[PDB]
Symmetry: T
Subunit: 77 residues, 12 copies
């Protein structure tokens, strides 16, 4: 925890069944390929209405993962 450095990527998750779906739907695919999803932050909740009655919630989130080598989980000052 001395020089742990993280990276934040932004992904947009989409689900016709809610915001908690899109959050989980997108966060999930992200992990299918990335390392250590540690946190997320929602930046927008938007959406499209197809057929006028089918919303496809589109939630944009910023997700953060550790890139630095698993190193000493320490405090050094």
């Amino acid at each position: 925890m001395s020089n742990h450095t993280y990276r934040v990527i932004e992904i947009v998750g989409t689900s016709p069944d809610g915001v908690d779906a899109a959050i989980q739907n997108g966060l999930a695919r992200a992990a299918q390929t990335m390392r250590a999803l540690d946190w997320f932050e929602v930046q927008s909740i938007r959406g499209h209405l197809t057929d006028g009655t089918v919303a496809h919630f589109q939630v944009t989130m910023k997700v953060g993962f550790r890139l630095e080598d698993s190193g000493s989980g320490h405090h050094h000052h």
Copy 2:
């Protein structure tokens, strides 16, 4: 799609059962009277607590609909 122009209105949807409710509750009434709801954007999630334990989620959204005559769905450059 050459000169399609849209209009954005802002509506606040309210539901005691969630944010996805208010979004759908309000978006829905909006369509009862407007043309071609194409998209929406959430701007705020607020709420009132009546009886101290009854939240009435109030979600404000900006909704967008086409005003321009259905015209050539085209690309011209």
Copy 3:
């Protein structure tokens, strides 16, 4: 209060005598023609200076009114 949906419009009120004037001057005209002004939110206080010494305060506000049919003032969850 179960599915009450509101609409927010934005108007700019102007008065040479203050911000509370423009707020009331504009909000007032808005009601001359709209239904149930319930709330307002100020977004900007700007102004022009004519003759260099005559400010015309221009206050932009977002005003909200009920569109949904007067329905049950109720809580349903």
Copy 4:
């Protein structure tokens, strides 16, 4: 200019040929039907890429027009 009150609407103009196009393309249709477009403010410049190489610039703007009766263009304080 004592109690002149204005209204601001938001429209999204779109053009495959630029931002100044979409601004003018949308502002123009707006006037086809509204009164006294006096000003505009850009809020976003976004866009879609169809065929991957055809951008359709979408510029969202807030446009303002006078609603109050043409009245004394005056200063009263």
Copy 5:
């Protein structure tokens, strides 16, 4: 309603089951100890992912309650 003054506090509610949970989970504890929760406003929806698949939604909200003595619910101008 003449000199009613309110106070706004900020709390972060957390739930592994959604945003509407955290909102209600946190708002609720807040009332366990405070007076007259009247309104709330969401400011952020964030979260941590433990085990990589267990999100703990963290919603930050600003909650508002009346401090001024229950006084005349009146309008005085």
Copy 6:
């Protein structure tokens, strides 16, 4: 002034007679019970319209007061 630390609270003041009223109406009650109001910052000017013609300006402000013991009013670097 070396380690003087302050605290900022947020209060909403309300008055049917203006924004300068609500600011003073709320700031005042705040002092009835707190120590050393030193500054304030307005964050929003909102309002409700009862009877459609009775605005109750609601101004939200952040107020700051000293918590640290009255200590040396000094500069140390």
Copy 7:
């Protein structure tokens, strides 16, 4: 009006008697020395409380004035 270019300066006006005072108090001194104050925009309304009961409203505004030579008031496209 073809190449009229303006400059915006920021000034903070202060008055113990209100926001409309500080706006006018500051805007005024600004003109004592500058050319053609044409517009202003409020950016903050803050304040200090001396004696705990004497607010000195401090309003920060951005003021705009013409620098370009009085030239053709024209439209050229």
Copy 8:
């Protein structure tokens, strides 16, 4: 369209000939190497002035592309 998840990257495009150039200049290189640029959003228009008279417009944009496998273009609720 049920679980389509997207990724947003941010790129800065630069052109001495305009903002629509930099937008297209940068968006273009981005596609030279990425999949399915679907949308873009401008976040800043900045620039450097070399030789004092050569602006190099620098437009920062957020571009979004699909990462999820081309899957059912469907609505499922």
Copy 9:
């Protein structure tokens, strides 16, 4: 970690020797009296210049602490 709810307070720390000082100077006093400072967020770095050459950095931060009873550090969904 199922219903852990937190509270965020805002404090301004001040030090003539830097921003990391004010952050630590203020955060520290805050703990002298509060429970479980878990996190902080900087919102502003401002300052006053006394004697014209003595800056007193004033850093405003939002600090967050747990209020809910130490309860099961668990995940429940």
Copy 10:
């Protein structure tokens, strides 16, 4: 480059022929009288519509120039 200090001024450029015009029209006049325009940042794109069909794009930008004496272009740490 050790103690190079810059100053940022804000100017509004205007042109009936576009945003890239106003940017260049205004930036240009600014240099007619200032030293070393090094960079610019757009803050707003607004405009007035005279005759309803003559937009006068008004672009506000923040421009930055060096004030410190041309000194060692160096790195010192």
Copy 11:
């Protein structure tokens, strides 16, 4: 303190040795030529990396100074 009016200028300070350096490096040059620097506000902390390992922190700040004649330090309402 009745009609004291201030002016805010924006300067960018730069130092290879930190943010507190650039703040002091720039604020300092500003005073070499201006009157009564009373306060400052940081707006951005940016930077360039020359040689890839030499950061030149660039901190932009808004600095405020009194322009109005030293007048009665008084409260008048």
Copy 12:
């Protein structure tokens, strides 16, 4: 410099010894693996307090690097 296009990534640097540490700690690891870090922008300064007295400053920054082939450093308009 005609079509140089850049990419901006966001990383969070962490150090128990300051903000200038985390900035340098994170920026550094980023370069260990990326090309041409040219600039950075701070977006947040946050932090965790372990043991209540060990802050781990977490600074989030946006870093920008060139992706386009080293090409003509030129101006072409």
